[PDB]
Amino acid sequence: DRPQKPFDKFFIDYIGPLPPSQGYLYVLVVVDGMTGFTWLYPTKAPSTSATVKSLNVLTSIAIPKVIHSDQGAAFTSSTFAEWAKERGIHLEFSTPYHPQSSGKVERKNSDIKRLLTKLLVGRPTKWYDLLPVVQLALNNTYSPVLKYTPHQLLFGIDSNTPFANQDTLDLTREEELSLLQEI
Amino acid sequence: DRPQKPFDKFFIDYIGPLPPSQGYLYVLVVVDGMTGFTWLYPTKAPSTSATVKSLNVLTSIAIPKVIHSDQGAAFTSSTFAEWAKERGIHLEFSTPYHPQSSGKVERKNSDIKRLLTKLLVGRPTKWYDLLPVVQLALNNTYSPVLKYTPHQLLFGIDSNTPFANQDTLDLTREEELSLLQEI
Amino acid sequence: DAELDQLLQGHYIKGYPKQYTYFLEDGKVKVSRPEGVKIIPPQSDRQKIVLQAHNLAHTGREATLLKIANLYWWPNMRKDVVKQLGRCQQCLITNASNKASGPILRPDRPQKPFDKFFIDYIGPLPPSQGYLYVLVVVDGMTGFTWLYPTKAPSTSATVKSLNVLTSIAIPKVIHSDQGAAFTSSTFAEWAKERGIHLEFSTPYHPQSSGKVERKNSDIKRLLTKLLVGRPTKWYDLLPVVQLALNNTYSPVLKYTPHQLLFGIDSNTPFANQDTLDLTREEELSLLQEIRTSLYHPSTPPASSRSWSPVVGQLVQERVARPASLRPRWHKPSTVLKVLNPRTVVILDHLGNNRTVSIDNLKPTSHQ
Amino acid sequence: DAELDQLLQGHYIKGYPKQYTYFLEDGKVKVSRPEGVKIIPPQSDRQKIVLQAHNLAHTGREATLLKIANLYWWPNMRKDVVKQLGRCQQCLITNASNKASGPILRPDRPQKPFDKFFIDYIGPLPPSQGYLYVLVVVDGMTGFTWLYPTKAPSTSATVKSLNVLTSIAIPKVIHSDQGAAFTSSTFAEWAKERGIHLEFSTPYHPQSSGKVERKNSDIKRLLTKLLVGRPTKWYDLLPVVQLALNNTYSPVLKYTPHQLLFGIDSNTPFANQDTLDLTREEELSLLQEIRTSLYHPSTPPASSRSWSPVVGQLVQERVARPASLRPRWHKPSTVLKVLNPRTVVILDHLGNNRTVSIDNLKPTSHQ
DNA sequence: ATTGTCATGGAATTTCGCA
DNA sequence: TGCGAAATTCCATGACA
DNA sequence: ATTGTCATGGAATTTCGCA
DNA sequence: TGCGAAATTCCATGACA
Ligand SMILES: Nc1c(C(=O)NCc2ccc(F)cc2F)c(=O)n(O)c2ncc(CCCCCO)cc12
Ligand SMILES: Nc1c(C(=O)NCc2ccc(F)cc2F)c(=O)n(O)c2ncc(CCCCCO)cc12
Ligand SMILES: [Mg+2]
Ligand SMILES: [Mg+2]
Ligand SMILES: [Mg+2]
Ligand SMILES: [Mg+2]
Ligand SMILES: [Zn+2]
Ligand SMILES: [Zn+2]
């Protein structure tokens, strides 16, 4: 078979609802399957409309051959199918209640959930401004399997913001106290 | 002696008062002594002020070495003397009650008086608009003594408006009837 | 199908070289070329392919072909590419030219004073005594210049000024640009009553009025110097500037405009006295010798990639005041007559006949 | 008197040639020269004479001398003329230069993507969804371009757009012109917090931002073509234009900005498939080979009459937005340091240090 | 303390297909 | 080892307020 | 049916003053 | 029939909205 390349397959999924941050409630996660590179777009709802608006931004930079998702309503709609057909994007769905992507992507989506949770606590309504630095951290994180970061695999260079101080990603015991107070 | 040249001597004099034509009552006559070329400037009064305004126009084209005039008040004033001194113009006056210029200039001033009179009658308040065509006629008039017109002696070329139809300059008997009616 | 059917079995078709093996795969005719495997589309698809590739970013010849060559190959691809570029209306009216105009003409200097006047307006200027503009009148032969301050660049103010000027002499021709004051019927009426032929520049080309335009530069340059460290009260300076420039030497001619018009200096500072012992008739004889022998430049060398107009050629006129995000060029038009190497008549985009400068034309690309 | 007294009796004085007879007439020392009889003024009068002749129309060297030579003669007249021209403040600040700048530099292309960004604003444009301007961000190495519509060319709108962009990567340097949005302290604060060095062009010299300026031309050219025969609704087209230009081939490079940034085409029409059998690591190895070997132009030949700056030279900076009838040049200033053949530091007319482009300087005439 | 750029289409040059 | 045609490269031109 | 122009100051060339 | 300096001519540069 042909070797795996960037833009061969984007994996998309929604995270939310979250505490409101400048009127936004959800986060559309897009992960490149080969490089692990991640894009994050905040939306007001997990709808076909908000998905198309966010992906119209991303697809003005690069168009994937395949978009993979679960059977969420926003992705199985015929509006989203017409949108993907106009751009030559093949849609690909996992079986209901059996979400399968890939080991590299599974662990990346795991990192995003825990990294959001760790920075949510203490400032739960201010995550909209932090999404840029979250992406930089995720995309300049050393891969155990491959030798390189997502940034290196996508652009073929070192980055001007390396994250050598690999944060623990676990919740400190004081963050459990303030997290157990709210929700 | 050195041969006579243009701009060696301007002869100036006032003609008026005349019937009002767009608020103007007098005419400042300027004649070049060598060529017979004539400039006509309408003024509201025979004052030093109106003389200086008219001659400021003419002296932005060419400055004479000498200005010759009678002992009129406008020309003998110290304001006009200061004006001529600033431009390097020597002032020259005829004896009172004995106006002497030159044969060429005397006959030219005669032509201007009679040519104005002939076109005044019938349209006495519309001479302001006719001063351009009056100058063209005077400056393209054949000289008996010299072979050439004032235009030819000044510019060294033929003119685009020659006046071959030399008008009689005398008053027809019907113009005497309408002239004897008014003034 | 038909052309490509004989190719698969092994017959020779003109344009398709023989030394490459043409096979079939995925229901498509392909070929193994040094760059890689390429699809050979049927003849009926190629126009659509060239169009799809061009319309991505409306790219030119090489940039469009580099797209097509990633997937496809067929004989003489650039011919089909160039055919589409010549039919794409948007590219023709939006793209810039890459051919320069032919070298400028240097029209013969008018033979006599008052043969040709050049007139133009300077302004608007800072208000001075309620005046905003200046009417500049330049004699073509001598360079002698008359200045008149006006409150608007109007036909009424032009007629009032030229009536004062034509007290001295009537000119044969008055040359102007196509500004509103000179193109009105009132101004043509004023000129016909006096036997003056009105001559107009080709539109949007002030080179053609270059004699008075260049004098406008000197007028403003002197006014600027005289007003340094002062409020810009220029109304009282116009007579000074007029007299100063008319008595200023042209280093290449060795004469002042006053000397070329009169043949003798008036009572100005540093007046020349070389002809003091000659009579006026001897002076005017030397003046006719001086006028005919004045230096005159010639056409410069053409730049290495210039174009010159041919009758029947497709050309496009430049849009005059193009709006934002709108094309800079009109639709193609045809050259009816070549008046000179730099001036032509064209059959306008509306249907009219229009006389234009070559600087406001580009030759339509791809014939 | 003293110098001219010995001349009349017949002694030799240096500068006054011997073969001409110097006589006295009207109380003035004269001389019979081939042009005619000329007055020799005493040394103490000559500066005043040169000044009177120059001030008539503030004329240059030859035009001023031709006035003086009508009446006067003395040894080395043009030296006294040139001395006055160098002291006339009005001529120095009003006259144009007649020496061209030295040939342009072609700075080395940035080695890596995100080493240097070039940013600039296009606008104002016709209103589209309440938006009037476009923020254009161009990567120096690749030419990859990001477009952002804004309602004003403000610092606030710049920060909002660049926060979205720097989600992808942080650049080392951001180059901009000295527009208000990029020179504010708010923008410097935003850049220092992210480790971004701000680099600014010399003032009033958009050549220095030429990479993004040239991209502005392509953006507007494509928008123009897409809007032919339609209302200018450009807001919805920015994503299309961005994608189209980033995937457009540069005929001289043989690559698209997308290919130089990623080393592989995404799912766009006519995507290149040459590296299909290579691994990504083999692909990125070929990408580093392609980036280093890109074509790079060199400095063109200097024009035959150019000037290059020397430390300590008197130069004058161009006035930025000169008012009507006001000089085009500042007063003379001194070159402190030569940063490169096209960029210098000068001791400003106010007293400050100022970094300027050579195109906005002229060398002061007559030393 | 900073610096011109590059798409475009005829023309010029090189390469190809065949012998 | 050489020809005619095609393909490629060259590069002046102009426009980014 | 119309068309570039010319002041400017360093550089290049010619002429001058003397032998 | 020749030299150094002065005088003259040459001409690229830029600006007339
Ligand atoms: N634009 C005009 C210029 C001008 O741009 N001058 C600068 C200039 C640029 C280049 C060059 F070589 C010389 C040169 F002087 C101008 O001088 N005049 O007088 C105008 N008079 C009127 C109209 C409005 C259009 C009228 C109909 C035109 O067909 C414009 C202009
Ligand atoms: N005038 C500006 C131009 C411009 O003229 N572009 C045309 C152009 C001309 C020539 C060339 F080679 C390229 C090129 F693009 C521009 O592009 N930008 O972005 C500006 N941005 C801001 C300000 C206002 C002054 C800010 C402080 C400047 O120091 C002006 C400009
Ligand atoms: Mg005009
Ligand atoms: Mg003009
Ligand atoms: Mg700008
Ligand atoms: Mg710009
Ligand atoms: Zn097109
Ligand atoms: Zn001066």
- Rg value, chain B, Cα: 17
* CB-side neighbour CA atoms (13 Å) of C55: 10
DSSP 8-state secondary structure symbol assigned to residue C293: T
Interface mutation vs chain B, best among C160, C167, C196, C274, most B CBs within 10 Å? C167
Query: Residues B71, B46: contact at Cβ < 8 Å?
Result: no
The residue behind tokens 């794409």 is C88
DSSP code at position D127:
-
Residue ranges near strand F (C-beta within 7 Å): C 62, 65, 75-79, 96-101, 303-306, 328; D 121-122, 179, 206, 210, 213-214, 216-217, 220, 251-252, 254
Pair C178, C203: CB distance under 8 Å: yes
Interchain proximity C90–D36, CB inside 8 Å: no
The beta strands (E) that lie in chain B are given as 9-15, 26-32, 38-43, 66-69, 90-93
Residue type, A9: K
- Using an 8 Å CB-CB cutoff, list chain D residues near C57: 222, 244-245, 247-248
Q: Is C232 on the interface with D (CB under 8 A)?
A: yes
Structure tokens at D169: 């990567």
Q: Is the CB of C98 under 7 A from strand E?
A: yes
Structure tokens at D365: 């005439």
Nearest to B57 by CA among C144, C238, C222, C270: C238
d(CA D39, CA B29): 37
| B135 sits in which H/E element | helix B131-139
CB D148 within 8 A of CB D167: no
| DSSP alpha helix (H) spans, chain C | 2-9, 43-57, 61-68, 77-85, 89-94, 155-165, 180-183, 185-192, 210-226, 238-246, 257-262, 280-292
Question: Strands C333-340 and C314-317: what pairing?
Answer: antiparallel
Bond prior to D110 in cis (omega within 30° of 0): no
For residues B141 and B152, give the distance between their C-alpha atoms in angstroms, rounded to a whole number. Answer: 10
Per the listing, tokens 């000074």 go with C240
CB D74 within 8 A of CB D46: yes
Measured distance CA(B138)–CA(D99) in Å, rounded: 52
Question: Backbone breaks in chain D (C–N > 2.5 Å) follow which residues?
Answer: none
d(CA D181, CA D154): 5
Identify the residue among D115, D134, D240, D280 best suited for mutation to test binding to A, counting A beta carbons within 10 A and taking the highest.
D280
Looking at ligand 2, which residue's alpha carbon is closest to its atom 21?
Answer: D179
**CA–CA gap between residue C243 and residue C144 (Å, rounded):** 10
Indicate the Cα dihedral angle B80, B85, B88, B92, nearest 10°.
Answer: 60
Which residues neighbour A33 within 8 Å (Cβ) at sequence distance 6 or greater?
A: A4, A8, A9, A10, A11, A68, A101, A102, A104, A105
| Euclidean distance between CA atoms C228 and D153, whole angstroms | 36
- Between β-strands B66-69 and B90-93, what pairing exists: parallel, antiparallel or unpaired? parallel
Residue A65, helix vs strand vs coil: coil
| CA–CA distance, D346 with D314 (Å, rounded to integer) | 9
Q: Which residues line ligand 1 (CB under 6 A)?
A: C 120, 177-179, 203-204, 206-207, 213
Tokens describing residue C31: 């070929």
Nearest-5° Cα angle at D50, D44 to D55: 135
Q: Does A116 touch chain D (CB under 8 A)?
A: no
**Residue D62 contacts residue D78 (beta carbons within 8 Å):** no
Picking from A31, A14, A37, the residue whose alpha carbon sits closest to that of residue A66 is A31
CB neighbours of A76 closer than 8 A, spacing ≥ 6? A93
Interatomic CA distance for residues C49 and C43, integer angstroms: 10
* CA–CA min distance C90, chain D (Å): 5
The amino acid present at C175, given as its one-letter code, is H
Structure tokens at D355: 């970094």
Which residues, 6 or more positions from B23, have their beta carbon under 8 angstroms from its beta carbon? B44
Instruction: Determine the distance from the C-alpha atom of residue D140 to the mean position of all C-alpha atoms in its chain, rounded to a whole number.
Output: 20
Q: Tally the C-alpha atoms within 13 A of residue C112's C-alpha that lie toward its C-beta.
A: 15
Order of strands, sheet of C116-122, starting from the edge strand that comes earlier in the sequence: C145-150, C133-139, C116-122, C173-176, C197-200
Continuous segment of H or E residues that includes residue B139: helix B131-139
C265 is in an annotated binding site: no
| CA B127 from centre of chain | 14
Decide: helix, strand or coil at residue A79. Answer: helix
Closest alpha carbon within chain B to C145: B61
Cβ-Cβ contacts under 8 Å for D271 (sequence gap 6 or more): C70, D265
Query: Residue C79's CB: how many other CB atoms inside 10 A?
Result: 9
Taking a C-beta distance cutoff of 8 angstroms, is the pair C315, C335 a contact? Answer: yes
- Residue A94's identity, in one-letter code, is S
Burial letters A111-147, b for 16+ CB under 10 A, else e = bbeebbebbbbeebeebeebbbbbbbbbbbbebeebe
CA-based nearest residue to A3, from C35, D272, D281: D281
Instruction: Give dist(CA A47, CA A16) in Å, integer.
Output: 12
In the block, tokens 């701000």 appear at: D198
Cα of first residue to Cα of last residue in chain A, in angstroms, is 48
Ligand 2 atom closest to D210 (CA) = 13
Residue C317, both tokens:
């006129």
Say which of D90, D228, D232 has its CB closest to residue C228. D90
Task: Nearest by CB to C242, from B60, B87, B154: name it.
Answer: B60
Partners of D24 in the β-ladder = D29
Q: Which residues of C213-239 are buried (b: 16+ CB within 10 A; e: fewer)?
A: bebbebbbbbbbbbbeeeebebeebbe
Q: Which residues contact B32 (CB under 8 A, 6 or more apart)?
A: B6, B7, B9, B10, B11, B38, B64, B150, B154
Q: Measuring CA to CA, which residue among D332, D87, D94 is closest to residue C220? A: D94
**Is residue D201 a contact partner of residue D145, using CB atoms and an 8 Å limit?**
no
Handedness of CA A17, A21, A22, A28 (dihedral sign): negative
Upper half-sphere CA count for residue B161 (Cβ side, 13 Å): 21
B98 touches chain C (CB under 8 A): no
Query: Do residues D141 and D116 lie in contact, with contact meaning Cβ atoms separated by under 8 Å?
Result: yes
* CB atoms C247 and D57 under 8 Å: yes
- Helix or strand holding residue B131 (H, E): helix B131-139
Structure tokens at B36: 């017979």
The type of residue at D359 is D
Query: Which of A64, A153, A159 is opposite residue D266, by nearest beta carbon?
Result: A64
- Write the DSSP symbol of residue D161: H
- Please choose, from the candidates B54, B56, B52, B63, the residue with its C-alpha nearest in 3D space to the C-alpha of residue B131: B54
Classify domain C97-104+303-364 at the CATH topology level.
SH3 type barrels. (2.30.30)
Strand D314-317 versus strand D361-363 pairing type: antiparallel
Q: What is the DSSP string of D56-108?
A: HHT--HHHHHHHHTTTB--TTHHHHHHHHHTT-HHHHHHSPP-SEEPPPP-PP
Q: How far apart are CA C235 and CA C127, in angstroms?
A: 9
Characterise A75 by phi-psi region: left (phi > 0), alpha (psi -120 to 50), beta (else): alpha
Which ranges of chain A would DSSP assign to H, the alpha helix? 48-58, 73-76, 78-86, 103-120, 131-139, 150-155, 173-179
Residue nearest to atom 25 of ligand 2 (CA): D179
Tell me if D74 sits within 8 A of D49, measured CB to CB: no
CATH architecture of D249-294: Helix non-globular (6.10)
Look up the CATH architecture of domain A1-183: 2-Layer Sandwich (3.30)
Cβ of D205 near strand E (distance < 7 A): yes
Task: Give Cα B167 distance to the centre of its chain.
Answer: 19
| DSSP-assigned letter for residue D318 | B
Contact C291, B164 (CB under 8 A): no
DSSP-based three-state secondary structure for C198:
strand
Q: Is D293 left (phi over 0), alpha (psi -120 to 50) or beta?
A: alpha
Task: Give the DSSP letter of residue C304.
Answer: T
Q: How far from A174 is each of A112, A179, A181, CA to CA, in Å?
A: 21, 9, 11
Q: How many whole angstroms separate alpha carbon D283 and alpha carbon D288? A: 9
- Is omega for the bond preceding D124 within 30 degrees of 0, making it cis? yes
Nearest to C115 by CA among C171, C160, C59: C171
List Cβ neighbours of A181 (8 Å cut-off, separation of 6 or more): none
Take residue C91 and report the two structure tokens written for it.
């590219």
Measured from the alpha carbon of residue C61, the closest ligand is: 7
Size of interface B-C (CB pairs under 8 A): 86
Is residue C170 classed exposed, middle or buried when 0-12, 13-18 and 19+ CB atoms within 10 A define those classes?
buried
Closest atom of ligand 2 to D180 CA is 26
Q: Which atom of ligand 1 is nearest to the CA of C214?
A: 15
Instruction: Measure the CA–CA gap between D206 and D201, rounded to whole angstroms.
Output: 8
Pairing of strands C197-200, C173-176: parallel
* CA atoms of C50 and C70, how far apart (whole Å): 12
Q: Could you tell me if B10 and B63 are in contact, meaning their C-beta atoms sit under 8 angstroms apart?
A: no
Residues within 8 A of D (CB atoms), C 324-343 only: 324-327
Residue appearing with tokens 């009056």? B134
Q: Which of C131, C175, C128, C185 is nearest to C153 (CA)?
A: C131
Task: Supply the Cα-derived Rg of chain A in whole angstroms.
Answer: 17
Look at phi and psi of residue C295 and say left if phi exceeds 0, alpha if psi is from -120 to 50, else beta. beta
Number of alpha carbons in the 13 Å side-chain half-sphere of residue D227: 23
**Alpha carbon of A153 to those of A150, B32, D35, D115, D172: distances in Å?**
5, 94, 85, 17, 19
Alpha helices in chain D (DSSP H): 2-9, 43-57, 61-68, 77-85, 89-94, 155-165, 180-183, 185-192, 210-226, 238-246, 257-262, 280-292
CATH superfamily for domain C115-248:
Ribonuclease H-like superfamily/Ribonuclease H (3.30.420.10)
Q: What is the DSSP string of C210-279?
A: HHHHHHHHHHHHHHHHHTTTS----GGGHHHHHHHHHT--BTTTTB-HHHHHHSS--S-TT---TTSSS-
- Position in ligand 2 atom list of the atom nearest CA D213: 15
DSSP H helices, B47-129, are 48-58, 73-76, 78-86, 103-120
Task: Using CA atoms of C45, C48, C54, C55 in order, give the dihedral in degrees to the nearest 10.
Answer: -150
DSSP, res D229:
T
Q: Which residues, in sequence order, are bridge partners of residue D251?
A: none
Query: How many Å does it take to go from CA C18 to C1' F1?
Result: 21
User: DSSP letters of D234-259?
Assistant: -GGGHHHHHHHHHT--BTTTTB-HHH
Q: Which CATH architecture best describes the domain D4-96? A: Orthogonal Bundle (1.10)
H-helix or E-strand spanning residue B179: helix B173-179
How many Å apart are CA B135 and CA B112, to the nearest integer?
9
Q: Tell whether the torsion through CA atoms of D277, D279, D282 and D284 is positive or negative.
A: positive
Sheet holding D36-39, edge to edge: D22-25, D28-33, D36-39
Task: Indicate the domain borders of chain C.
Answer: 4-96, 97-104+303-364, 115-248, 249-294
Structure tokens at C162: 């030229």
Q: What are phi and psi of D107, to 5 degrees?
A: -55, 145
Rounded CA gap, A140 and D169, in Å?
A: 10
Give CA separation, B166 vs B152, B161, B163, in Å: 17, 13, 6
Looking at this protein, which amino acid is placed at residue D106? R
Burial code (b: 16+ CB inside 10 Å, e: under 16) for D47-64 equals eebbeebbbbbbbbbebb
CB-based contacts of D250, cutoff 8 Å, min separation 6: C63, D143, D256, D257
In this structure, what DSSP letter does residue C320 have?
Answer: S
Protein B179 CA to nucleic acid G18 C1', in Å?
81
Contact C166, C191 (CB under 8 A): no
CA distance C54 to C83: 11
Q: What are phi and psi of A159, to 5 degrees?
A: -105, 155
Angle at which helices B78-86 and B48-58 cross, to 10°: 20
